[PDB]
Design a protein around this ligand. Structure first.
Ligand SMILES: Nc1ncnc2c1ncn2[C@@H]1O[C@H](CSCC[C@H](N)C(=O)O)[C@@H](O)[C@H]1O
Ligand SMILES: Nc1ncnc2c1ncn2[C@@H]1O[C@H](CSCC[C@H](N)C(=O)O)[C@@H](O)[C@H]1O
Ligand SMILES: CO[C@H](c1ccccc1)[C@@H](O)C(=O)O
Ligand SMILES: CO[C@H](c1ccccc1)[C@@H](O)C(=O)O
Ligand SMILES: O=C(O)[C@H](O)Cc1ccccc1
Ligand SMILES: O=C(O)[C@H](O)Cc1ccccc1
Ligand SMILES: [Ca+2]
Ligand SMILES: [Ca+2]
Ligand SMILES: [Ca+2]
Ligand SMILES: [Ca+2]
Ligand SMILES: [Ca+2]
Ligand SMILES: [Ca+2]
Ligand SMILES: [Ca+2]
Ligand SMILES: [Ca+2]
Ligand SMILES: [Fe+3]
Ligand SMILES: [Fe+3]
Lengths: 333, 333
């Protein structure tokens, strides 16, 4: 490269940092949805209607324009060449920045071994959960609902591990009227939110929750509620079962604790292998690098394939996800 | 563009975020310096010598590789096509990420008018100082020393506004043996660090520090020493004198409080005008957008040029900085 191409590419990397953060902000602030509707918006009017500091709004849109997501035209912002694709993945930018941004920012302090004890990094838990809700729906839904449609039976009681919001149980309950739901979650506030939402939507006597660690499900004393369960679901947390030896034991314990489960639908993103550095897709590098910074295990697709039998399960169908790195839904029984 | 081009462009945007944050980290951890000296390093060797968590180290270089700053070949990392440019500007990336990242991450919380009271954003001050030390040396020093070389007299007492770590005063004292220095800084902590630094370097009896706000310099008590000053310097903070009416009055106050000043050397970065969005150079977008988010004024070059006479000074020479957005050093008298 000439010196001028290098100048441009490095300016682009810099401005990309700001665009990236602005994608998640423009999502959260409602700008991306206004642009989808009308293909354009008026900067001052947007600022006034949302009661925002307008010079900062102008910077937000400039950042987006600097890399081609939007285009500024006098007083208006118009969708740009990368708008549909950036908007498609917005929840992943939000996860990277608003969610995980402190982690990455603190790279020089997280890498040194002497610092890697106790609480050595900070995530924004509320932000991560704001993004994960749309990730779950946008990337995992087609395959999740394809798996539900090949169950070959009508579930009667569904249990969801890492139930969070309760949203999956509510959606299963809208599709299977009078199905019962049970959500297991390790956080009493994820439980409290889920209970409110379920009641708010008129399901408080179909769906209940239990505080519980899915990794050691034998320590939860809801046997008998567990014994009713004929469908088990676990999305976006499977990798926390690892390393391999712990995963095997978690899987065996889940098999014992839900002895009437027919299908177990397990969905997660995985560590990729061998992708060339200049062709990394969206999400991959952040997911993998983040977990390596936090010291947390991330298995590959092959590692999952290789663990089910030892863990007490048989994989009878597997769905590729589009494309949240390499992500999958396994149908186990 | 095709969907493929857009897919690629949005992925690069995502990855640039991680590479961006990695530039600063790789500076601070010593990787960029090692790669500048040898053109390459060995990832495991590097991690052992620096006692870093190697999976995170690999992640760091991978980030840098994903946008062409380095290349990975087996177990080694090698300089890539944008290495010289990114290394040149590494302190700007550090400033954006390590220093200012929490500002830009919190864009959804900082933009709403109802959040904008009290402490509504958070910068990392030690990080900002670490980066500012190199920004001063790498971008400002040549114009600074040129202005010192054209003073047309030999200073006897120098005052530095926003003295920081005391480094500029130490360097002046090395240039003019026997000159006295006086640093004014608003932050007690800068005073204490500067005093320790100066004592350690042996300039304890020549350089002193007084806590005070250069925007209200008429209120700073400095044992009558201001009247002995014959050179005044102020780098990287002049924009904090603005808006214009405050700047006029601060400049008059400085003229009256340092009546024996001959030259006043003023160096700062400025707000640009009319740069096309897709042509923003490095730094420019962050510096401007950051100040707008913070609610702080940033003047253009023309605004400076047009304030001096009313403020009681004459500009007799002006130096262009090479490329820190649009930055300059004014020589005033
Ligand atoms: N070991 C564990 N046992 C139970 N819940 C867990 C867990 N590890 C994480 N969680 C919970 O699972 C959620 C992870 S996010 C996944 C949310 C949900 N499955 C969805 O598709 O949106 C959080 O609510 C967290 O509290
Ligand atoms: N109004 C004000 N009066 C005095 N010092 C100020 C100030 N606003 C900012 N500062 C100080 O200015 C320093 C800015 S960093 C710039 C440091 C130095 N002039 C250099 O070139 O390297 C900090 O220590 C901060 O405390
Ligand atoms: C908390 O959810 C996030 C997620 C994102 C994509 C796939 C799986 C999980 C992530 O921070 C996690 O590792 O659990
Ligand atoms: C703290 O120094 C920084 C700087 C960088 C370049 C030019 C001017 C100022 C910046 O955060 C500031 O506005 O004071
Ligand atoms: O090994 C696998 O590929 C999957 O884990 C599940 C599977 C196996 C065989 C046939 C279909 C699905
Ligand atoms: O107006 C200007 O450009 C500068 O602020 C100072 C200058 C003016 C005239 C000749 C030289 C320097
Ligand atoms: Ca309009
Ligand atoms: Ca464009
Ligand atoms: Ca921490
Ligand atoms: Ca791609
Ligand atoms: Ca080597
Ligand atoms: Ca390359
Ligand atoms: Ca004062
Ligand atoms: Ca002019
Ligand atoms: Fe995780
Ligand atoms: Fe500033």
């Amino acid at each position: 490269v000439s010196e001028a191409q290098a100048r441009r590419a490095v300016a682009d990397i810099f401005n990309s940092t700001l665009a990236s953060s602005a994608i998640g902000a423009a999502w959260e602030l409602g700008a991306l949805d206004e642009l989808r509707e009308n293909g354009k918006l008026d900067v001052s009017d947007f600022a006034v209607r949302h009661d925002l500091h307008e010079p900062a709004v102008v910077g937000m849109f400039t950042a987006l324009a600097s890399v081609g997501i939007v285009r500024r035209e006098g007083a208006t912002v118009v969708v740009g060449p990368y708008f549909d694709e950036a908007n498609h993945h917005r929840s992943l930018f939000h996860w990277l920045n608003q969610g995980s941004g402190e982690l990455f920012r603190r790279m020089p302090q997280v890498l040194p071994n002497e610092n890697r004890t106790g609480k050595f990094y900070q995530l924004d838990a509320g932000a991560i959960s704001y993004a994960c809700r749309e990730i779950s729906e946008r990337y995992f839904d087609p395959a999740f609902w394809a798996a539900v449609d090949g169950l070959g039976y009508t579930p009667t009681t569904v249990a969801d591990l890492g139930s969070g919001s309760g949203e999956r149980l509510i959606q299963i309950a809208r599709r299977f009227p009078g199905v019962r739901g049970l959500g297991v979650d390790i956080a009493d506030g994820a439980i409290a939110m889920a209970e409110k939402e379920v009641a708010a939507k008129g399901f408080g006597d179909q769906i209940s929750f239990v505080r519980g660690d899915a990794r050691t499900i034998d320590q939860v004393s809801a046997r008998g509620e567990f014994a009713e369960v004929d469908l088990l679901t676990c999305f976006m947390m499977g990798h926390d079962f690892w390393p391999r030896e712990n995963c095997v034991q978690t899987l065996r314990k889940l098999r014992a604790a839900f002895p009437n489960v027919r299908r177990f639908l397990l969905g997660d993103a995985t560590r990729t292998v061998g992708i060339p550095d200049r062709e990394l897709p969206v999400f991959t590098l952040g997911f993998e690098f983040g977990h390596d910074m936090m010291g947390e295990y991330l298995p590959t697709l092959d590692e999952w394939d290789g663990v089910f039998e030892e863990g007490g399960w048989r994989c009878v169908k597997k769905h590729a996800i589009d494309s949240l790195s390499v992500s999958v839904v396994f149908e186990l029984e």
